[PDB]
């Protein structure tokens, strides 16, 4: 069973700060990139679409182009870590991460922005 997990379901994040939220996935010996897909969305907006080691910027909701990124050096550790800079009130809500890597699962994370 490939399953994705979260450290916590709910994150409290300070208004005006940079945040990182994470989903974990089992990784064997080394990371096979070509077999890996990582997706983050929030409220049906597409944040990250990482397909075999390439962000497809075409399908990214363009308001995140600059403020959102997947921490690349955490993937070998089985950690999909989305980081958004300059967190505002609108960034509060429910985020979804999906990871596919022999094969697939997803989870939800609540972000609460304290201001």
């Amino acid at each position: 069973a490939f399953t994705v997990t979260v450290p916590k379901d709910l994150y409290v994040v300070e208004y005006g700060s940079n945040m990182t939220i994470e989903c974990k996935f089992p990784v064997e010996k080394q990371l096979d990139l070509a077999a890996l897909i990582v997706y983050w969305e929030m409220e049906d907006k597409n944040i990250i679409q990482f397909v075999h080691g390439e962000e497809d910027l075409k399908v990214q909701h363009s308001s995140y182009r600059q403020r959102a990124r997947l921490l690349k050096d955490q993937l070998s550790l089985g950690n999909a870590a989305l980081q958004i800079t300059d967190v505002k009130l609108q960034d509060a809500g429910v985020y979804r991460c999906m990871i596919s890597y022999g094969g697939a699962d997803y989870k939800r994370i609540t972000v609460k922005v304290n201001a």
Partner: protein
């Protein structure tokens, strides 16, 4: 074009079998279909997949329908369920049925 998951409410006596149907016709280039139960929180916990326990997913002869089958149903299996189609290419996407509820009684 979300999948459907029926019947949307289902009562059965413990020990019996419990069978939802998830129907999903999709033109997606690469995708998987997952069966979820909601956690005591609202977390999506995967039970099974097509392709890949007493939680068995089975494609039917017409192809667009799948039985999600809980065999020999326990009482604390009672809870909320759903099917989630996940497309992987070219565009990654999650498509969820409405939630169904399973009541298992003594």
């Amino acid at each position: 074009n979300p999948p459907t998951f029926s019947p949307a409410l289902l009562v059965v006596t413990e020990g019996d079998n419990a069978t939802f149907t998830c129907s999903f016709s999709n033109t997606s280039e690469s995708f998987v279909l997952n069966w979820y139960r909601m956690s005591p929180s609202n977390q999506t916990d995967k039970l099974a997949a097509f392709p890949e326990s007493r939680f068995r997913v089975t494609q039917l002869p017409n192809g667009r329908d799948f039985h999600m089958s809980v065999v020999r149903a326990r009482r604390n299996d009672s809870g909320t369920y759903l099917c989630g189609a996940i497309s992987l290419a070219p565009k990654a996407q999650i498509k969820e049925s409405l939630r169904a509820e399973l009541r298992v009684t003594e």
